Specification:
Chain F: This is Large ribosomal subunit protein mL48. The structure is cut from a larger assembly and holds chains A, B, C, D, E and F. Chain B is an alpha+beta fold. Chain B has six helices and eight strands. A four-stranded mixed β-sheet of chain B has the order 4-1-7-6, with helices on one face. In chain B, strands 2-3 form a two-stranded antiparallel sheet. Classes of the chains: A alpha+beta, B alpha+beta, C mainly beta, D mainly alpha, E mainly alpha, F alpha+beta. Chains in contact: A-E, B-C, B-D, B-F, C-D, C-F, D-F, E-F. The structure holds one RNA strand.
Chain lengths: 119, 217, 45, 99, 64, 116
RNA sequence: AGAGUGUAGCUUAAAAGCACCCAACUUACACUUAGGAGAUUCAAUUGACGCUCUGA
């Protein structure tokens, strides 16, 4: 029922969501965020974290993104969050590690598409 | 202050022979030849080898080996010029063919009175002389030959100033195009050095620091 | 460092085989080159 | 005249049937992977070496021009002057067998 | 009637005479990174944010 | 707006340069445009060495105007690659040329010829 | 002998981020994608290990 910021049509990304999944792939680390429109990071999962980093071979590969997708999805089911928006750039859309990340999220339990606002 | 005005030069030989490969470069080169073959597209040499013996099997059922054999024996005809005139000599330090795959540097004994120093070859300049022309005069003076070198610019390369009367020492860098180095068994003490003997022949701080502008590769 | 620009491969894809045929122009100077029909040595008269 | 030679020859179309077979094993691609990994190691160490040489020699020549400037204020003006002998500058690549 | 800016203007310190000597954004992603960093900084104009807003561990971890 | 202190906060055309002899005047000296021809009997060593030159030049902050190639010749075939360069220093002429000298693979020659 | 000292290239980063390299698309570059390598000199804020500058 709550408002989404409907506007922002000339600017990337759109602010029309309640929760956004924002992947930050650095040189060394894959990072995954779940945010509000406020910018309040609700649920994160980075490989800069000893609980997940030590079970990985390399913190940047497709295995790192499937791992951070399983871990992020399990962390978000227990936060009462079931609907994100993931809006990628058209090269990051067609990357293998984000297709593997999205398949990890959808198989985890999270639908990557928000329901409409009830007016 | 009376400055003892000193110019010099650091002479270079470009290697005519290429360096040998790393064994890791051997495995990578072999791998690139394999995967290079794997993506090629029907060379006529095998079209004149593969289907031709199929058609000869069809004719016998009812020459590429000579080309390869002639190429093999003609490969056995011309012996290669050996890349190592380096270990057989082992003491021809004055000769220009001491090494072939590395750079070679001219390096001359000088006997002074207060000193007695093995020195990268110098000259004495005049304020009327150009520093590049100081090094050009340095070329055909000390060796007494008919070489052909080549400079690059009036930019210097390495400066070292020692006193005991002020002084300064300027190090340029030349490059041998060719050489008509006549009578290589000179009375002078020029020695060609790869890199390692420069830390052997040259001890002090004005001479153990030449290799930081010697093109080491 | 005379081996950096040597570890190559044909960067095209519509290319046939090439073979490491040693070439001499006139001077007894052998260079490894790739040419059609696997020759071993060359000399230009 | 804009005539180049990147145009592909027409014969490379029809008989493309000599090698459709590309099969390998596990350990062949493992050793191929170790060659790419350790070869990027080797090449990275190489450009660390060359970057060290450009840094060392470039600071060497800048320190040299500073000392030549402060010990001769009429020679660093001509040390910057360029040579007209570097228009037709050439060097052929190295060989194997000396003549 | 120009009035002078209150704080420092953006795009001031990078504004040089030789832009072709300045290395550029080769991508879209780097501009998105720097651009989000400039979004999060406190500014002096009116912005959207005003209105809508030990050693053994590294030892065993490195060996681990 | 023209009277507000944030006037011209959104302007950008001074930040894009949306648009030959040598410059050797009195102290700051630099070559004009150049040409570096690479001739070889190999497409591979000439193309790949032109790559190594071009990535050196981008790794040493040099304007590289073009990197085109010249047509071949019926002879064996001789291949050429032209990698243009504009603007060097006194030290950087020497230090820049010594690496191109000291990195040639096999029999491929150079040229520091200029334009026209 | 003294002085300045000190995280991988750079950091008023605290084991990070940019830098960097190979492979692929590109003539090539660039983008992008797949990978790779990385470090807080050694002991108790302090001394001693390595570098730079000034000395003989």
């Amino acid at each position: 029922v709550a408002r989404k910021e409907r506007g922002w049509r000339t600017v990337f990304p759109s602010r029309e969501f309640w929760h956004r999944l924002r992947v930050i792939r650095t040189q060394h680390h894959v990072e995954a965020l779940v945010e509000h429109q406020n910018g309040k990071v609700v649920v994160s999962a980075s490989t800069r974290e000893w609980a997940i980093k030590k079970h990985l071979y390399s913190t940047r590969n497709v295995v790192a993104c499937e791992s951070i997708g399983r871990v992020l999805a399990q962390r978000c089911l227990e936060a009462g969050i079931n609907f994100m928006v993931y809006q990628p750039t058209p090269w990051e859309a067609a990357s293998d590690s984000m297709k593997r990340l999205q398949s990890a999220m959808t198989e985890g339990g999270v639908v990557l598409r928000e329901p409409q606002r009830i007016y | 202050s009376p400055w003892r005005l000193l110019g010099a030069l650091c002479l270079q030989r470009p290697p005519v022979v290429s360096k040998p490969l790393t064994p890791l470069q051997e495995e990578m080169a072999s791998l690139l030849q394999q995967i290079e073959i794997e993506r090629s597209l029907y060379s006529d040499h095998e079209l004149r080898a593969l289907d031709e013996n199929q058609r000869l099997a069809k004719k016998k059922a009812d020459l590429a080996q000579d080309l390869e054999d002639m190429w093999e024996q003609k490969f056995l005809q011309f012996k290669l010029g050996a890349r190592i005139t380096e270990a057989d000599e082992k003491n021809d330090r004055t000769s220009l063919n001491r090494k072939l795959d590395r750079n070679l540097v001219l390096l001359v004994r000088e006997k002074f009175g207060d000193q007695d120093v093995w020195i990268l070859p110098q000259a004495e300049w005049q304020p009327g002389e150009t520093l590049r022309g100081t090094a050009e005069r340095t070329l055909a003076t000390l060796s007494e030959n008919n070489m052909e070198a080549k400079f690059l610019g009036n930019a210097p390369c390495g400066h070292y100033t020692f006193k005991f009367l002020g002084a300064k020492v300027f190090f340029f860098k030349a490059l041998l195009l060719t050489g008509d180095f006549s009578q290589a068994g000179n009375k002078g003490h020029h020695v060609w050095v790869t890199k390692d003997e420069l830390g052997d022949y040259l001890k002090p701080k004005y001479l153990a620091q030449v290799r930081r502008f010697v093109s080491d590769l | 460092d005379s081996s950096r620009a040597s570890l190559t491969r044909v960067h095209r894809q519509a290319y046939a085989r090439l073979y490491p045929v040693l070439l001499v122009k006139q001077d007894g100077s052998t260079i490894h080159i790739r040419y059609r029909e696997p020759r071993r040595m060359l000399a230009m008269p | 005249i804009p005539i180049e030679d990147f145009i592909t020859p027409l014969k490379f179309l029809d008989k493309a049937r000599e090698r459709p077979q590309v099969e390998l094993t596990f350990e062949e691609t493992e050793r191929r992977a170790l060659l790419l990994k350790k070869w990027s190691l080797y090449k990275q160490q190489e450009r660390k070496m060359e970057r060290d040489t450009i840094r060392a020699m470039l600071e060497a020549q800048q320190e040299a021009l500073e000392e030549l400037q402060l010990e001769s204020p009429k020679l660093h003006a001509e040390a910057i002057k360029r040579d007209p002998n570097l228009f037709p500058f050439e060097k052929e690549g190295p060989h194997y067998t000396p003549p | 009637r120009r009035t002078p800016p209150l704080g420092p203007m953006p795009n001031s310190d990078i504004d040089l005479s030789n832009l072709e000597r300045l290395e550029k954004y080769r991508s879209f992603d780097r501009y998105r990174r720097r651009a989000e960093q400039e979004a999060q900084a406190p500014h002096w104009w009116r912005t959207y944010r005003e209105y809508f807003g030990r050693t053994q561990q590294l030892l065993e971890r490195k060996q681990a | 707006y023209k009277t507000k202190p944030t006037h011209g906060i959104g302007k950008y055309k001074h930040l894009i340069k949306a648009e030959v002899r040598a410059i050797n005047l009195g102290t700051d000296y630099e070559y004009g445009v150049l040409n570096i021809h690479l001739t070889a009997y190999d497409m591979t060593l000439a193309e790949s060495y032109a790559q190594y030159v071009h990535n050196l030049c981008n790794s040493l902050s040099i304007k590289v105007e073009e990197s085109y190639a010249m047509p071949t010749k019926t002879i064996l075939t001789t291949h050429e690659r032209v990698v243009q360069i504009s603007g060097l220093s006194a030290t950087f002429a020497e230090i820049f040329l010594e690496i191109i000298q000291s990195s040639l693979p096999e029999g491929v020659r150079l040229s520091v010829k200029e334009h026209t």
